[PDB]
Every structure is written in structure tokens, then in C-alpha cells.
Amino acid sequence: PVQKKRQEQMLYGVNIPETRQMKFEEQHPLLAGALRKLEGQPKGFPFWYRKYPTRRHAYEYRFSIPVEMLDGYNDDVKKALSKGMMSIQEKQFAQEAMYMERYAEHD
Amino acid sequence: KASHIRIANRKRVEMFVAKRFHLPTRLATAAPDIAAEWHDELNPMHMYPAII
Amino acid sequence: VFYSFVLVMKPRQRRFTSQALREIGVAVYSNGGLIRSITNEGIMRPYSRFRDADNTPLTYARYIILQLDMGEEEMGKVDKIIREHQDVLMALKLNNLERPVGIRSGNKELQAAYFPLDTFTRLEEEINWSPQTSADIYTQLEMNWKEFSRTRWSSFLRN
Amino acid sequence: TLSPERVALRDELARKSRLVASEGMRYYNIFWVRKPLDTMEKEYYELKRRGVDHGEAIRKVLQGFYSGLAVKKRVAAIQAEEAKLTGRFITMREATVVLGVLAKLHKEQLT
Amino acid sequence: GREGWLFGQQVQLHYHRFPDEQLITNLSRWRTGETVPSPEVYMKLNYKNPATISRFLTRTGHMYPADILPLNPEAVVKLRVAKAQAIRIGLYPRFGNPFWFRSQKFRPKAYQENYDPTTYSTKRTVEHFAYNWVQTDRIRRYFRELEAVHTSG
Amino acid sequence: INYVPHAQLREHIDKELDKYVAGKNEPYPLNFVGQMPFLEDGDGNIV
Amino acid sequence: SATRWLPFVSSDLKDYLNRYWAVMFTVGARPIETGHIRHYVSWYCTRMKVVLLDHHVYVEPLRQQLQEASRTPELPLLFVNKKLVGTLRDVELLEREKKLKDVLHFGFEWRVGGSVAATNGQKSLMGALPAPYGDAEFFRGRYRGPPVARPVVSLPTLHPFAL
Amino acid sequence: MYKKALHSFFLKVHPDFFHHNRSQQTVNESSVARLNELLSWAKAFKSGHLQPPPSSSFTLTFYRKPDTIIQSTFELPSNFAPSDNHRGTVERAVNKFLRDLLRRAACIDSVTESISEAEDATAARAEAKPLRRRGPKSLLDEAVESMTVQWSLTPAPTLQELIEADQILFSRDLSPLQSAAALSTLQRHLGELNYSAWESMPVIVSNQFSIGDLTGTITIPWDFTPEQFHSFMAHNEKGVARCREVAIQYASTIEQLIAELCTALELDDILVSCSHQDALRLMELLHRNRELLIQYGLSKLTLEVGNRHATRANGVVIINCSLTSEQLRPWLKAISPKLPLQQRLYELSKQMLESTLWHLKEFRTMVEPGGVDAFSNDCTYAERLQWSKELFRIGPSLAPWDWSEMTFVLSPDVDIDWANGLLALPYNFDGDALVRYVEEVQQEAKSRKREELLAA
Amino acid sequence: VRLLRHESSMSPSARAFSERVAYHLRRSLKACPGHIAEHIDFTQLIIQEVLGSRRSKEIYIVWFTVDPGARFELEPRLHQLNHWVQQLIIKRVKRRPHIPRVT
Amino acid sequence: AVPPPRVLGGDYFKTRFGYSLVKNSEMTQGPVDYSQLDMWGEMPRYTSDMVFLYLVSRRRNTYAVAYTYEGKRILNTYTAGNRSTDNGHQVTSMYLNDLLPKLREMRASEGRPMGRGEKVELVVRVMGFYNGRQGAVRAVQDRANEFHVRYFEDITPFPLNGPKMPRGVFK
Amino acid sequence: VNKQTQKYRTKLRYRFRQPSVVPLRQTLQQRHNTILEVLRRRR
Fold this sequence. Notes:
This is part of a larger assembly, with 11 protein chains of 10 kinds. Chain C is α+β, with helices and mostly antiparallel strands. Chain C is 25% helix and 21% strand. Chain C contains 4 helices and 4 strands. By secondary structure, chain J is an alpha/beta fold. Chain J is built from 4 helices and 5 strands, in the order αβββαβαβα. The chains are: A mainly alpha, B alpha+beta, C alpha+beta, D mainly alpha, E mainly alpha, F mainly alpha, G alpha+beta, H alpha/beta, I alpha+beta, J alpha/beta. Chain J: Keywords: Ribonucleoprotein, Ribosomal protein. Chain J: One of its GO terms (biological process) is translation. Chain J: GO terms for molecular function: structural constituent of ribosome.
């Protein structure tokens, strides 16, 4: 578990398997899954995915969300995911990623 | 561990520093004539002589 | 939701509670925070009578749910403002909103296998369910219920 | 046994049909529900042949099921109204209830 | 007198146990596909549900032993924080259990002093067709308005 | 999510305080506990 | 040791039978019939799992599955070696016929004909051999046995659940 | 192997898709039943017990949708016998038949039917020269599974579910036991001969032999042999098809006008209490004068259709069937000030109905009784709401006792039956007195048990 | 049993131990397991005295009810508390000469 | 086992007991909203004219107090020193001897006569698990013509934490 | 561990304890039945 936590910190979708159902989702379907299914603004394929192969590349926003993902949302959703709303673990991972940008051999 | 008491049921302070400092140095207890001149309108509602 | 509060307040006049909630919202907005929601739950009679600053047992109390997105130092500032308020008898801080209860102390293999965006993006009523809330109410919102519920009283009007 | 995709499909269709039959239509005396439910299944497979969507196929299937329930309610109401207007035809529940209430009147006569 | 009440009211053999149960049985028999934790408890193990906290506590409000009440390991963690959070804001008493008799399934009858398990397999579906006296006047008024609409129309 | 702005804070608080009133032609909603609270009139006095 | 302690719970009857040797499913409103089986099983030094159906999370699944294994809706029910023993009328019958030792310890009931409760001295055959042509009644000068006594009036019991 | 092919075939020729034509639907039902019994005796031949088939050679007809009539014959060899050496050549026969249904349907590949013909050729060559040998399903074994688990027809409804369906009717002029003899010995063991397409038709028992006097039902007199009914439905099948089609068209042309009156006038539902042949003229009159109803204050109100011009107190108005266009405007000007009173009464009635249904649901969940009936007696909604809230208030106090055998019912008088399951209560009953009564009953039971244990 | 032993016959340590058992039994009789406490009618329960042997190998708690007909309602459930009484003696009572058998 | 007999009407059901199901107040109200549920729904239903008798039994003392519905002490607590099984019996009997005229004086000041035919509604609550518990409630059982006891319960302390206990209890 | 966890650990150790099941009363019961059979059968 101490390695799976750092793997969740570093890599993006290591929790999500091929079946697209988490270990917490299969036991708690009402809490993890989405409650409403809205037919509206499908974002499509990410063409900007080359800039962010790891979560250390995007520490500007919360949950390692890139800047291109928040395009049509209002200023409240963008402010709630800003640097001021990050947790202690997210700020410490941003401090870690600041040096990982500087001293890493590859991504 | 450490035990605590709440000054005027709101301000959680530690029990040792309360008997030495926090309890006898309040505004409503130590200076009642000065605390009677407290402004209730212009001051914030979370600030009152029972805790300040 | 990032943070939630259940403010138990003294049933004072309307202007005093309005000024208290306005000062709480001003202290939220001045520290660079956002109010997700604020809902009034009316005056109820609790099982325990809380004491005010002048040690009077209050039989009645007003409950207010306050959902906020604030930074943690600013949340500590707003929590110190709220807990030292004269009208607030008690207020618990819901800090288990992003991660569900039972993951940290439960199974160690089921610790990094959750998604925080599942719980962060929904409201507090969708995390902590009320007794009137259920799954069929959530499925009714996507089923075009307006064209279906128009015939539910066709049997009771004649009896 | 049952196929698990068919298990999830029947779970979704039963959860969405129970609300339209119980709270929506307020119709509890519905007869022979297996034929409209299997018609919902076969219309879903007909829409999955062309592969249109997932939720919109459920929407059209529930619209067809609602129209079928309305047609069945209307023909039941028409047959009941024509059986009550002429006064010549009596259903089996009315015969059971008069055979019960005449027996109860005879038990009143016995005491 | 009235003419819509006749066509609105339908004749009944038995009313129901609760009026939607045959739809539940038919939809459950079709949902399982056979030829003719629970999703609601962990979402409601919170401070705002006083009955779901009380259905896992004893009469004085405290905890049962593990051999009497075995539970999911996360459900106990939810319960012990839900009880404390509901006690803290006054939605639950510090002593007692105000929803205890709502949670006991094995209830004795009003003319009995203990619960007996032989009453579980009664399965009385009104085999002798008992008609209550309040239903007989409704039947007679239904047939009177039927004869009135027969002689009128 | 419908966030509350700083300008519409007072009107939202006054609308939330007028949720449970004495005179209303609309049925009152249940609380988060699931219980109808005590109704009140203007100036916050409990009926 | 290697795993933290956890209370066992199951929604199926088959997981209780495959786990424990002796399982009993009781109710809290029936303390006399529960405690009699507690006395019989602990006398033969057999490990026993008592499942109180009061305050259980799978009461309605377990009350249905106990109706299929045992046709009577009477609790408690004893289950030894994935088999149905039964209620107090079935446990006391094996105790009377001296069959409760090999049921609780080794999981089988003796199919031997004849009763072992009515024995005197050593247990032998003593006329158990088959007689020629039958007709054990027509010899009226047969050995009737020792004279037995019968009470004229029923003595008052110590307790109503003493037996 | 053949799963997608038979899946697409049963997707094409299933009778549940053909709703525009009823004759194509019943021919597809008969063909599906014949194919099902054909594969049934084919699996019976493969199992080991051999029975003579119902048909040796017959032409099966299906209908297709263009999004088209597929006819194929089934022939048997003339040397057919129930011996073992004929159990193989029949297996190559029905597999020759099924692909004959699959080739004309144009839903399979020619490579697949070439594979099946090659497999039948291997079986025919290996039947002559004996070999030895020491698994995927064939066309028959996949066909029976794709028939049974996905594309099976719905089973015929039994008599017990037809009793509560309001579909079994009888005229009582014959006798009660004439109808009982027409039902018990003529529907239990004679329902197997009745067709599956027949099962949508309600049955009236009357004097004569006919095909219907009501909308969409059929009649049958005093005791009959099932061959007589089989010859009766083989004589006038066109009339019993056309009556069902005109009944469905009548229901659809009612429902479309109901839907347009609901969407245009923003109301909930149109109620009717008279004959629909006279209600259709009033509905089309409201459809022609729809903008006049928009111009007046006739909106968000349910409309009942009766014989007397009247207004009910719960918000619904009653409109007579016989009404002309020149009489519509003074009728609309007569009840014009009474419309907002009906609107506020309708909103109050909906709120009180929702409140009493919520209170009865909470009473059913808390105490779990045998049943609650508050809609029996004709009372106001205030009395029913007061009764439901008084039962809801004493819900937690009746919680230590189970009431699964008793019925809570609204009545004009107190009736507490313990030998039966009856608890009849007035609208204004003291719940604390009822709690004291049940506590005194429990005190009687406890004192009786204590005196019984002291007597022994 | 026929008689009851006097306090002068037993040891003074036995009298002190029985007084401690009586104190901790009359104090925390509501602090029992709740699955037995839901059936015990505490309105009739009376614990009059505790007797013991000279070295406290067994303890005999003497009890009766107000109404005798309720005694059979309080008889079996009270015998489901012997391990609870033993754990109460192990926890609450110090200087115990033996861990006693409860009767 | 055996069901209690059937009641067919409320008019003689009023004569069978000391109460009636149908209320004569005729409460006309229009609360369309949902009613407010009580905090303690599964409890004895205490009427406003009910006297709460508290019997505290000890080793050598037994105390009997009487309170109103609102918590007002009617009569002072009787002590055996001021005024065992017989000790609790005589204390409860001499308390119920003087409790009747004080009840008549406190109810006649408001408008309740309580002269003839009406028994005092009583709720008995006991503390102690002692021998004086035996004689005390029996001293209420012979007063059935005067005091009608509806709820016989007990008030027994749950030892939540406790401040401390003396040395003779532990050692 | 601290004082509280040590007290709860020894409380759980005294509460859930596996005793030594030594069949002594059944041995004495078998001996009593054998002595009664000998006293019944032989003078």
C-alpha cells in the first residue's frame, strides 16, 4: 500500500483496470459511480495528451487536472481547482514535482 | 493526554494555561466597567468581552 | 465538496441570524473561498439542550448546512471565526468528504483504489444521504418523468 | 442461468419500468407483463443491431412501453365500461364477491 | 346520485398486503430471468439518519458484542462516527435509543408475552374469504349505483 | 454545481430564511434529517 | 495472528455448515430450548457455534433457508456435519437412544435396530435371535419379566423446564 | 459458430416486431411454435428416446422486414424408422432444413452453409464406413439454446392470473354452475389446445355463438368440446383479427386526442365516465375549439366526462357528452368565475393526497401491518389525512408488537376484532387510548402467564 | 438447598469479598450484555445478599422477585450472566482469593 | 395464545374502560404539511395529570418522593430516621397516607375536584435492587382503590464513568 | 502502548480466553454410574 499510494501520486490511471471499474466502485456502486447521466458537452479525444504523461507534469491545478480540460466551465469551477484549494499532500507533491522537472532523466 | 475547557462555551483552550492566563485575564471578568462600554453594533459578532 | 459544516444556531430574531450568516459568508469570501451551498433546515428540538455564553439551556435550535471550498489555512481561520461565534452553539467539521470513511483504517489493499473526483464533484446530499433520498429518485431525473407522472391521480379523484 | 449483460439490462429495465408502472401510471392490475417486457428486450436488441446509442435506446424502449401500457389501460377501461353500461355481463371477481356477501347475509340470518 | 364513482372504483377479491406487491413480484420474477452489502445502508450510515444508527445499537444505545451482531468492518467504522456526530449536534441522545422497537423484526403479538418462531410460516392468504363488515356496505352501494346506471342508461 | 456569488449572498440568505414560514400555499420540504421542523413567522418567532 | 480478528457473517446457510462442525441458529425469545442444547453439546465436549438470529443482518435470507432444510419453523435447529439434527425433540431422542455421542463427535447416526435405553446388567442378545414360525404370543407361559412399578399420582415437578 | 447467424435470423422473423400486420404475426407465431416442436423432437432423437414427429414433410412460412416472405419446406427420407441407424440421417435432415431457412433469409455467409454441408457430408460418409475416435455446439444445439434463452415466446397465461385480470367475463343468465362447468373443466385441461395468439382476447360466456358484441372480446356458450372451439376459430379468424385491430385503433385514436389535450391545455389527465363513442365527439369538439379554451381560463385542470353538468369539490369538472358548438360558449361563460376556485381546490387535493400517501407509506414501513385501507369510506380528504397522521403519530408506540395479521381500516365506528384481522377506526380516535388498550391486552397476557406459572 | 450459611461462619476475608461482590453487582447490573438486557425485567429483580465459601472458590448470590410468577421470566436470563459476573470480579474487584464459580 | 374478545362499537367501549377512543374535542385543523414526530416516540404516553412516585431502596433506608408532570415536588422525602422490607413498606404506606390530601389541595386550587370515583394516576419508578424494593411496591399494591398504577418501571443507574470509589470496594 | 491500550488489551485478554477443557465431571459421572451398577448387580 505504501507503494500503491506513490503510484497513485505519480501515474494517472493505475487504479483503473481494463474493465473500467475500481475496487471501491465494485463494492460501492452508488457512491463511486455517477448519479446523473447528462447529454451535454462531450469533450472528445484529448489531442493535448502528449504534454502530460505523468502527474508531475501538471501541478498547476487540483487532482493533476491540465489547463486544457477546463475550457467551458465557469470561473467558480476553475477557482475551486486552483492552487489555493490544494491539500497538504497536493502541495507537497507539487514541491516534489518542481524538483522532478529539474533533475529527472526522462519523464 | 491533555484536557481542555471552553471559555463561555465557545473558546477551546488548554486547561493549564486557562487557570494561569486565559480565564482571569478576560475583558468581561477582570474589567467589568470597561467591558460595559463595549460597542455591540460596529464590532464583529464573533468578538465579545466574554472571550476577548 | 471540500468542507461542510452543520451550524447549530440560537433561534434569535431574523436580523441577527441574517447578520451572523452574512458575516460568515463575508469571512469565507474575503479569505479567497467559495460557497458551494448554504441551506436552512428550520427550527428543530434537539435531544440535548445546548448552553449559550450566559449558561441558559435552549430547548430549540436552528440547523444550517454550509458547503464550502476553501484553502486549509483559510478554513482554519473561518473555523476559528465560526466556533467563537456567540450564536453558534455547536458546529462539526465534515473533513471526510473527499475520501469516504473506512478506507484509511479499513483494508490496506483498498486504500489507493478509490477516486477522489467521484466524491469531490458531487454535493453533500449525494454523499451523506437523507432518509427521504434513494436511488429511484435519482433515476427519476433522467427518465423524462414529466410525461409519466401526469396519470398518477386518475384513480383517487373519483374516491 | 442468465447472461450477465442481459442481467444488467434486465436490472436497468426493471428499475426503470417499476417506477413508470407503480408511481407513474398508478396501475397495479396490469395483466401479462411478460409480453411487453420481452417486447422491450427485443426492441432493445433491434436498436442494438444498428447500434444507435445506449441511453436513447432505453428512452425509445420506455416510450414504447408507456404507449403499450396506455393502450392496455384504455382497452381494459373500454371493456369495463361496456360491461357496466349494458348490465348483462359480470366479471368473475364480482361473482366471487356476491357469492361471499350473500353467504355473509345468510350468516347474519343465522344469528 | 354520482356516476363517475362507479367506473372509478373497481371490484376486489383481496385488497393487498400493500397495494403494489403483485407488480413487485412480477418484476422481480422477470428481473431474475427465471421461467414462471445493500446499496441503501452504507449511504445512510450518517449523522442525519437516526434510525440507521439505532438499528445496530442496543436499547441503552451502546454497542452489541461481535458474536451477537456481526457486521461489515467498514459499517462499524461508519456507525461509530455517525453516532458521535449525531450526538454532537443533538440529533441523537447521549443515552438511550429512540428507534429501538422500530428495528426489532421478531416482535411478539399483543396477546402474547414472547415471540414464537411458528408464526413465521403462517402464510395466511385468506383461504376462507373473510369479508369485513365495512366492505359489505361498499359492495352494496357499488351494486346499487350499478343498478341505477342500468335502469337509467 | 450552483455556487453562490458574493453579490447574491444576502438575497440567498433571505430566501433560505424564508423557506419555512407560517403562510405558504406550497408544501414544505423535509430537512436533511427527514423531519418537518417547527414553522415560524416573520422576525423569526417560533409558532 | 497473520490476519486481524473479524466476526464471521454470511447470507447463505451453506457457508455456516462448511465452516463450523456444530452450528445452532437460535432466537433470543427462546432461552430454555437454547440452553438445553447448550447442556447436551458441552457434555460431550463438542465445539459449537451459536448464531443468535436476533440483531442479525441476514435474518430474512436465513429464515427462508432454514425452512428448506428443516420443514418445521421451530428454532433452535442443530446442524452437525452439514446435516440436519433438528429441534429439542430430536436431540433428546438421540440422548435417550444413546446416539448423541456419535452424532456430535463423528457426524453419523446409528442405524442399528433395537433400543439400548432399556437394558439391565450387561448388554447381550438375550432372546434377540429369530424364533421359528413366529408366534411369540401364543405361548402364554412365557417369561413376562420382572414386575415393574407405576406411580398412582403424578408428583409435582421441581421446575416447569426441569425435565 | 452459428450464434450470430441464428441471432440475426430470430431478430428478423420474430412476431413481436410485426405489429402493423396481425396475420403475419400469427403466421410467425405458428411457424415459431412448429420450429420449436421440430427442434424438440430433434433433441429427443439425439437424447435416445424416439417418438414419431407431428409432421414428416411440411412447408414453413416466415415474414421478413425490409428495414419479403421466406418459405421453406422440410422433407424426410421415405425409409424413416425409429431405429438407431436413422438417428443420424435425421440430424443431417433438420440441419439441411435450418440452413434452408438461413440461406433464403440472406443473413449468413455462404462459407458457413458450405461448412455445414461439409459436416453433413462427413457424417454421411462416416455412416457407411465405420470408424473410431477417442466441444462446440452444432446448428441444432446452438439453435435450441438461442431459442430457449433469448428468443423464446412468452408463455400462455394461466387461469388464476386471468381471474384477477378482468378478462374472464360471463353472463349470469345461464347459471352460476353453468359458468363453473364452462370454466373449471373447460379451461384447466382445455387451455393447452387454445392458441397463443388467442390469449390476447378476453372471453365472455353468453348465450349464442359469436365473435363479439363488446370491443375486442369473444363469446362462448354452455359446455363445448375443444374440437368445436378449434373449428370455430378456424371459421371466422378474419373477424377476430379485425375486431382486435379495430380495438387497438380505437384505443390509439382515444390516446392521441388525450395526449394532445394534455399537452395543449397543460392538464394532467382526461377522465371519462360515459360511452367513448359519445365522448369522441366531445373530444374532437375540444380539439377544434382548442384556441377558445386557451383564450378562456380552462387550463391545468383534469376534465371528467359524465352525463350531468356538474363540478366536483376536489378540483375536477364534469362535462356532458351531448354538447354542441353554439352551446359551448354559454357553458364556458357560465363556469368562468368558478375556474380559479377549482384550480386551488385541485392543488389542495393533490397536496393532501400526497401527504396522506406519504403518511400511510411511513405507517407501513414503521409498524409493518397486514394492510391499510383509508380509501374505502366516502369521506373528505381532511378526515383521511387526519386518520393517516394519527396513525403515523402512534407508529413508534405500536412498534414492539407485530400487526401482520390485522388490517387497519377507516370506518364510521370502532371495531377491534382479534379473532379476525380487523381494526376499524374513526377519523377522530385517541391514539393514546389505543396504546393504553394494547398495553392492557399485554398486561392481561402477562398476568395470565404469571398465574399459569404460579398454578403449576 | 435447605439452609443459608451465616456471616459468622465464613472467614472475614470472605465477608469482605462478598461485600465487594454485592457492591459491584448492585452498581452495574444494568451494565450487562445488551442482548440479555433486552429480556430481563429489572422491575422485579432483587439481589438481597452474596454468600461465599471460606476461600472464595464459589460465590452464591441470593435473589428473589417481587411477584413470584415473574421469577420464571427472570430465572434463565440471570443464568446467562455467570461469565459476566466472573469478568466483573476480575475487573472491578482486587484482592480476590480465587476467581469464583457463580451460583 | 388466545385472542382477546371483540369490540363492535365505541359507545360501550367507553363504558368498558375508563377512557374513550373517539375524542369529544372535535379538533378542526388544516395542517396539509407533514406532522412533527416526537423525539421519544416509543415511550409511555404520560398524561399531564399523572403523579411520578420514586422509590429509592437502600441497605437501611428507603425513600419515597412524589413529583408532578413538570417536576414539582409534592411532598417532602420521608426518611425512616425522620418518620428492610417492613421499613420500605411502612415508609411508602405513611407517604401514601399523607399524599392524598396534598394531592386534593394541589388539584382543587386549579379546578380538579378528585373527590369520588377518580383514582390517582401513578407511575412508579424504583431504584436500588434491595430488600426494601419488595415491601415498598406492595404498599402501593393494596392502594388499588386510591392509586391506579399505569406504568410500573424502574430508574436504575447506568455506571457511565464514575468519579471514584472508596478503597474498601476495590481492595 | 500507553496505559489505556494496555488496560483494554488485558480486558480483551481476560474477556476472550480459551479455558482448559479437562473432562472431569464426565469421568466422575461414569464412575458414579459404574459404582451404581456394581451396587445394583452384586451384593
